[PDB]
Amino acid sequence: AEARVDGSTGVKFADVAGIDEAVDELQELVKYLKNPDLFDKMGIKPPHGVLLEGPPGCGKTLVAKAIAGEAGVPFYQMAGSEFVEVLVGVGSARIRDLFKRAKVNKPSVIFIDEIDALATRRQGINAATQERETTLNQLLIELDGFDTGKGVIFLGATNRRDLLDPALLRPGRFDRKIRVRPPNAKGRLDILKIHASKVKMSDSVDLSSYASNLPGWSGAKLAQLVQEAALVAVRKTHNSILQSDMDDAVDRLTVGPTRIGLELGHQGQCRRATTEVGVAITSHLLLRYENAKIERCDRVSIIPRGQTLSQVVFHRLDDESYMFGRLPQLLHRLQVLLGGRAAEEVIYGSDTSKASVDYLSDASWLARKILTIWNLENPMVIHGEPPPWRKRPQFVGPRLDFEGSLYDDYDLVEPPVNFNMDDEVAHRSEELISQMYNKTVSLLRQNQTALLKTVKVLLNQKEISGEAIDFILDHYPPQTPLNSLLQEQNPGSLPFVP
């Protein structure tokens, strides 16, 4: 068992960014490792063990290495899966040997990565299970036998706190439970600065925009983004990572790489163009007229990327507006969702297609969450219903995370007894859906030249931007005749150069 006894781990708190709350919490352990006698004179009992829980790629191991480097103490890093073998009793012996080695070199920091492999719960939903139980019992015995004044600090990193044994979560084994959250916009900015300090960077790259535009990205994902952009710059023979390389790496990680001439016929492409352009146009019109608190269409593409034949990039709003979702905002978002089928109806008459049914699904669920789960109207209901179909919140597809998620009931569902209220709720939902669909069809039919011009421009260029859509809306006021667009020399031409 080569537990690496490194005098200097090479990582300090200067290399940790965006995990500032956990760094502030663990500064207490760093201080205790620095002067344990100061805690000793006060009668202060240090925690026996600390659980670092969080998503992978947040640098929990990096945080532990930073703690060890700042404290200047021996650091014994080992993975939990290394304790799981075929021969029973080897893992317990390894646990005992590791704890003995830590007790020899006091003070010291022990780190167990992926502790959920050893501390898996005995779920009620080979001899490996017995070996895991014996190793877990040995770990519990070792943790319970620790004297607090010996200056040995135990850390356990985990990605799934639900799988952990509640015995370890009891006081005396894991006294501190610190949640390593994903870094914020400032934290992602700092992580991007740290990773871009290691590679030749061009001055045109603005790291703040990519920090703000990539929510939920871990530090490892940002490092992979920087490395992929460097690889793209090498492929393009660039001397430094340009902003174009950053954008290409972002698009590669988010929506995937572009294919090579894999295109279908003109019939199956104009329909997707109509859907995406109608959704973007409806969102922009709702922003323009009624000042809706909705998102903004950044860019629209119809080139296949990954497994998506078309995409509409949507700029994510701040989270403070993602809690108090009022009725007008939800109705406007329902209008945005129905805008695709509205565009298919106003452009292609009464012969619609399947490409607009998917959005038609979400709206057909969302109004239900207006009437049953949230109970926003005021005939009061008695029970909610679970979503029959569940779709994960994701990328360029519509946001559907305005209240955190769309297809996630907050355990507010009950089985029904009376079946008449069910058909009353269904009638009310059908009425609301039909009213909103009629409203968005009436709104879209009043602006036909702008919609058709945007469709033709996107069909020619294969991509469009939100500012281009706004310029089309400015140059085409409401109620213009279609002959103005149809008399132009080239409908798929835009005189605006960004």
């Binding site: 899966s81 075929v86 992929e228 690889l231 090498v234 492929r235 090579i260 497994q307």
Partner: protein
């Protein structure tokens, strides 16, 4: 020791079955093919110029497009030895971690003779995305893919070895294995176009059957009939065309067995100059006329517009 038994199977390729000049649907990425070949014929040339040589090339497509034949043509253009390592010896399912030593020995013996090609077929079966297998097929696979990752990330040591791996779909390979530096070039071979199909089919007509029957066949219709096929099927098309053309007439079995057996037995004694004598050439013709086996244009025309 699977490594030594696999390394016993060198094959210095000089004549590929389907050469690169004849292979279809390759002109869109033939520049990368030639760059890889230039690296293989002189790894020191790529070493001195300092650019990152292609360490890995993945070829994807349908079962039968000639991906193995494409690799053979690339190696023949490179004049480098290859080894055919199968998927079975990589996953020694007896001890946990034996695949690590297996791939370490393969790379060590490859560096001792590099530039060489490590050719693996059906790369999707064992080196797929992590997490799909649940029951006792994770730790060994994780160790194997980790050793692969640590071997493809050799720190600027350009020995000259590349990994010709064959998969069917681009999604099934692990994303950590998709990155450049470990996986440099990707060749997507789907289907030949109409005129490439016509040229390959005419070459097959020239190299397989009687030449005198080549001109009577309207090969444009045949090429419009074989659109969804692959070059090996474009090569085996004339065989099936002759079979289905001889199918048209009314004939028995036993006489054909008799003549087949007689020509099998008495082709071992006959002299070659008597075999190619003009008397022998005019013997075959009235043998065919007597048997009523004269294959005509209209027979094969009805055959080719009869097939799908």
């Amino acid at each position: 020791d699977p490594i030594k038994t696999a390394f016993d199977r060198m094959k210095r390729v000089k004549n590929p079955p389907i050469p690169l000049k004849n292979f279809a649907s390759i002109e869109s990425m033939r520049e990368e093919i030639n760059e890889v070949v230039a690296f293989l014929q002189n790894p020191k040339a790529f070493q001195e110029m300092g650019a990152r040589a292609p360490r890995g090339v993945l070829i994807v497509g349908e079962r039968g497009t000639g991906k193995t034949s494409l690799a053979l043509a690339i190696a023949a253009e490179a004049r480098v030895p290859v080894v055919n390592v199968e998927a079975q010896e990589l996953e020694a399912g007896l001890w946990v971690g034996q695949s690590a030593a297996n791939v370490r020995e393969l790379f060590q013996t490859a560096r001792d003779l590099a530039p060489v090609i490590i050719f693996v077929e059906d790369f999707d079966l064992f080196a797929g995305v992590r997490g799909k297998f649940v029951h006792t097929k994770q730790q060994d696979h994780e160790s194997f893919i980790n050793q692969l990752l640590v071997e493809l990330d050799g720190f600027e040591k350009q020995d000259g070895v590349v990994l010709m791996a064959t998969t069917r779909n681009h999604k099934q390979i692990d994303e950590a294995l998709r990155r450049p530096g470990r996986m440099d070039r990707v060749f997507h071979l789907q289907s030949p176009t109409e005129m490439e199909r016509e040229r390959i089919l005419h070459n097959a007509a020239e190299e397989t059957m009687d030449r005198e029957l080549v001109d009577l066949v309207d090969w444009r219709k045949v090429s419009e009939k074989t659109t969804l096929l692959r070059p090996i099927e474009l090569k085996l098309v004339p065989m099936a065309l002759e079979s289905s053309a001889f199918r048209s007439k009314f004939l028995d079995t036993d006489e054909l067995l008799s003549y087949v057996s007689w020509f099998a037995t008495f082709s071992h004694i006959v002299p070659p100059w008597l075999r190619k004598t003009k008397v022998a050439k005019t013997m075959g013709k009235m043998l065919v006329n007597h048997l009523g086996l004269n294959l005509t244009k209209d027979d094969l025309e009805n055959v080719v517009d009869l097939m799908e």
